[PDB]
C-alpha cells in the first residue's frame, strides 16, 4: 500500500483524544471508509468521506458518535473509552478502484 497510517498516541488515556493520521498524497483518490476490526465489511463500518463532494457519508453501524473524519482520511476519536480500543481498518478508494486496505490498532488505559 501507498497509504501510511500513524496512530498517535498508541496507548491513550481514558477520556483523551486519539488520532489515526493518514498520509497519502495521491491525486487520484475518490474517498475513504474506516472500519472497526480487520475486515472491510459494511457491518463494521464506522464512517467515510467522499472527496469530490467534500462530505462525510452516513455513520456506519460501528460508529460511537465521537469520531470525526477529515478530508485527508485522518480519524479523530474524542473522549476515548475502553471499548474504543482495538483494531481499525482504512479502505482507500481510488478513482480507478485499485483500492487498498491498511490496518492499525491502539489501546486505552
Whichever of 12 and 48 has its CB closer to a copy of itself, that residue is 48
What does the block give as the cell for 37?
Answer: 476490526
Tell me if 86 contacts Cl ion by CB under 5 A.
Answer: yes
Q: In whole angstroms, how close is the CB of 71 to a copy of itself at the nearest point?
A: 13
Among 40, 87, 94, 103, binds Cl ion (CB under 5 A): 87
What does the block give as the cell for 25?
Answer: 498524497
Among 3, 24, 33, 74, binds a copy of itself (CB under 8 A): 33
Q: In whole angstroms, how close is the CB of 12 to a copy of itself at the nearest point?
A: 27
DSSP-assigned beta bridge partners for residue 75: 20, 69
CB burial of 3-41 (b: ≥16 within 10 Å; e: otherwise) equals bebebeeeebeeeeebbbbbebeeeebebbbbbbeeebe
Of these partners, a copy of itself, Cl ion, none, which one is at the site of residue 39 (CB under 5 to 8 Å by kind)?
a copy of itself
Amino acid at each position: 500500500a501507498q497509504t501510511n497510517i500513524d496512530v498517535v498516541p498508541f496507548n491513550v488515556a481514558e477520556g483523551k483524544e486519539v488520532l489515526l493520521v493518514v498520509h497519502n498524497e495521491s491525486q487520484n483518490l475518490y474517498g475513504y471508509n474506516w472500519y472497526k476490526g480487520e475486515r472491510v465489511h459494511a457491518n463494521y463500518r464506522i464512517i467515510g468521506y467522499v472527496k469530490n463532494i467534500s462530505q462525510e457519508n452516513a455513520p456506519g453501524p460501528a460508529h460511537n458518535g465521537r469520531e470525526t473524519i477529515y478530508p485527508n482520511g485522518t480519524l479523530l476519536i474524542q473522549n476515548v473509552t475502553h471499548n474504543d480500543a482495538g483494531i481499525y481498518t482504512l479502505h482507500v478508494i481510488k478513482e480507478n478502484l485499485v483500492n487498498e486496505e491498511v490496518t492499525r490498532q491502539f489501546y486505552v488505559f
